[PDB]
Each structure stands twice: as structure tokens, then as C-alpha cells.
């Protein structure tokens, strides 16, 4: 089975071509922490710790072109599928993990064995290592699940509230001309307030979820970075 | 005798149970901000930094509530 | 002066990007694509009727 379809970004692609045929400075980035990993001077890393910047920026652009514009009615999030997000996060996370593993430095994993020599090795430390190794994959899964669920829930709620607002506005506006106009006015004002609140909340939540999505990957990378001191 | 029964209305019950998970999430979020206020009054110079950490905690806590809310939609729409 | 992004044509830059900048990511993506087309590329008639 081969389905031929298209993304919902063609107009946005046209706008990108129109408005970016000439250069422009960028000074505001959703996830700025990918550019500043080291905060104490004289510390440097031999690993390619700045390799994630390009992917981070592209992912932010793509997910912002989809999610932020999805607040416009009838705009489609073409990628909104659980397993597709799983594939994306699998790609990024496993690629970085295999980059660390191909280094063939086993000492890098010494920190997995949690605790000190005082703790019993078999009954405490080994179990903790098992849990942490499980927790890496669980972090991947939680990242993709969170990204999926936030969008799904937000858009379900928006659709339901908009349906209710349409119903009351269309089939009960005549109450403005009736003696119970005050009740309708109160309800309409409440609905407007709810509309504004929901839109603001969704706008903020989209950006914050993208921030967290990139921060999980950067945390994976940082957990295995080692910094040398200049002398 | 072998009898197979399929009750349709049960999906409402499971949906309502998942919503209870939001009670912890909603409470958990309020706990973060309560500490934020009690912390900004102890060291206001870091208010901007603390506000940033509070928001991060809100999303992580909020994320869990969405997991439950997804299950509610799944059963409510199936 | 020579820069890959400014001097090379798009296909060449694409190959360079995915071979000397993000090769592991490309490998993982190809692996996942093969998996999807090997295990998630079928739809029965009943499934088509349902959904």
C-alpha cells in the first residue's frame, strides 16, 4: 500500500522563499541552550558537542510551522501520529546514543553503576544500573509521548469548546431581544474569556513543549560529555 | 453455558477514573508555585531564575496529566 | 574562500551533510525506513473498510 499525500506547509514554504531570498539576522531562539553548553571558561570538550545545533534549529522550525499555525481553524498537523513521533525521536536519540557507543570507551558507562563501594554491589548497585539503563529508553518514550499527548489534548479541547460556542451563539442569540438577555450576555462574555485563555495557553504550551523536546535530547548528550581544563 | 456480553456504557466509567489523575497534577502544580512565592520572598534577586525553573516543573508535571487525558479520549471515543 | 554551503551545489552539499556531518542519523533513518516498509506497508480489505 502506497498513499500519496502532501503536507500542509505549501503556503508557508512559499512565504519562506519570498521572505528569505535575502539574509536576515536571528536573535531569538526557542532553545538557546544548545549553543551554550559550557558556562565556566577554560573548559573545553573534544567531542562534537555542537553537532546538535543544526538539527535543533531545523526541528524547531518544522514543529513551529506545524503546531503554532495549527491554532488556525481547519489547519492540519500532518505528522500527528504516535508512531511517527516515535520514529523521529528514535532517530535522534538512538543516533546520539550510537555516536557515544561507537566511541568504544567503556569507562564512559562507569557512572551507570550508581552508588559507592559501601553499597552492596549485587543487590543495590546492579539493580540501580538496570533501572538507569531502562530509564534512558523510558526518557525517549516519555519525550515522544508527551509531545503527542499535549497536541492531541489541546486540540480536542479547542474543538469541543468551539462547538459549544457555535451552538450557543447560533441557537440562543435571540435571547438578546428577550427578557433573559442578561444570562446570555454573561454566558457570551464567559465564552469569550475562555476562548482567549485557551488560545494563549495553547500558544505558550506549544513553544514550551518544543523547548522540552530539545532539552531532553541535549540532556542525553550532556550526560556523557566530559570537559577538560585548559592549562 | 458460554455467554459473551459486551456492555457499551462502561467506557464512560473508565474515562471518569482517568480524570482523577488530574487531581494530583493540579495539586502538584499549585505546590510548585507555592514554593516559588515562598522562595522569591527569601531571595528576590533570583526571581527570574526561579520563575524559569517553576515553568519547567509545571510542564513536566502537566505532561503526566496529558497521559491520563489521552486515555480518557481513547476510551471516550471508542 | 571555499565553504561547502556557499560553493557546492545542493546535491553535493546534501551528500556531504549526511556523510561527514550527520552520517549516523542518516543510517538510523534508513534503518527505520526499511523497518516501516517491511512491517507497516500492508492494509487488509477489512481494515480499509473500517478505517
Amino acid at each position: 500500500m502506497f498513499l500519496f499525500f502532501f503536507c500542509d506547509l505549501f503556503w508557508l514554504r512559499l512565504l519562506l522563499c519570498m521572505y528569505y531570498c535575502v539574509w536576515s539576522r536571528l536573535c531569538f531562539i526557542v532553545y538557546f541552550n544548545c549553543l551554550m553548553l559550557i558556562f565556566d571558561f577554560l573548559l573545553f570538550c573534544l567531542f562534537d558537542l555542537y553537532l546538535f545545533v543544526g538539527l535543533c534549529l531545523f526541528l524547531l522550525l518544522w514543529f513551529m510551522l506545524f503546531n503554532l499555525y495549527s491554532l488556525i481553524l481547519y489547519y492540519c498537523i500532518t505528522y500527528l501520529n504516535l508512531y511517527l513521533l516515535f520514529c523521529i525521536v528514535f532517530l535522534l536519540y538512538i543516533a546520539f546514543l550510537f555516536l557515544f557507543c561507537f566511541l568504544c570507551d567503556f569507562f564512559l558507562f562507569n557512572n551507570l553503576l550508581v552508588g559507592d563501594s559501601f553499597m552492596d554491589v549485587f543487590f543495590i548497585r546492579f539493580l540501580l544500573c538496570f533501572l538507569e539503563c531502562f530509564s534512558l529508553l523510558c526518557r525517549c518514550l516519555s519525550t515522544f509521548l508527551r509531545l503527542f499527548c499535549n497536541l492531541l489534548s489541546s486540540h480536542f479541547l479547542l474543538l469541543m469548546f468551539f462547538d459549544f460556542f457555535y451552538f450557543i451563539f447560533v441557537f440562543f442569540f435571540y435571547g438578546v431581544f428577550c427578557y433573559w438577555f442578561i444570562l446570555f450576555i454573561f454566558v457570551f462574555c464567559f465564552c469569550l474569556l475562555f476562548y482567549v485563555f485557551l488560545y494563549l495557553l495553547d500558544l505558550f504550551a506549544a513553544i514550551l513543549q518544543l523547548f522540552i523536546f530539545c532539552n531532553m535530547i541535549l540532556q542525553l548528550i550532556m550526560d556523557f560529555l566530559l570537559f577538560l581544563l585548559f592549562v | 453455558s458460554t455467554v459473551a456480553i459486551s456492555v457499551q456504557g462502561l467506557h464512560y466509567v473508565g474515562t471518569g477514573l482517568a480524570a482523577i489523575a488530574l487531581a494530583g497534577v493540579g495539586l502538584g502544580i499549585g505546590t510548585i508555585f507555592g514554593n516559588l512565592l515562598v522562595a522569591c520572598a527569601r531571595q528576590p534577586n533570583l526571581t527570574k531564575m526561579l520563575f524559569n525553573y517553576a515553568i519547567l516543573g509545571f510542564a513536566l508535571t502537566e505532561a503526566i496529566g496529558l497521559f491520563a487525558l489521552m486515555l480518557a479520549f481513547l476510551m471516550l471515543f471508542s | 574562500v571555499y565553504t561547502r554551503w556557499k560553493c557546492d551545489r545542493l546535491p553535493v552539499f546534501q551528500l556531504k551533510l549526511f556523510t561527514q556531518e550527520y552520517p549516523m542519523h542518516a543510517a538510523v533513518g534508513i534503518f527505520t525506513i526499511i523497518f516501516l516498509w517491511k512491517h507497516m506497508s500492508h492494509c487488509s480489505e477489512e481494515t480499509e473498510r473500517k478505517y
Binding site: M1, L82 | - | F18
Partner: peptide, 29 residues
Amino acid sequence: LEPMSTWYLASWAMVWYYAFFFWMPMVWT
């Protein structure tokens, strides 16, 4: 729900893979 579906997952993911392998270089350059 299609978001939880898999009967055309491969074709659906081709969009992301095209974006990653063909559109990202253009945006990069």
C-alpha cells in the same frame, strides 16, 4: 483514531523523512 493507526504508517512517515533528507539541506543553505 488515525493518530494511533498503523495501516499506512510508512507512507505517513515518508513526509518526515523527506523533510529531513531533502528540505533540511535547502533550509540549511
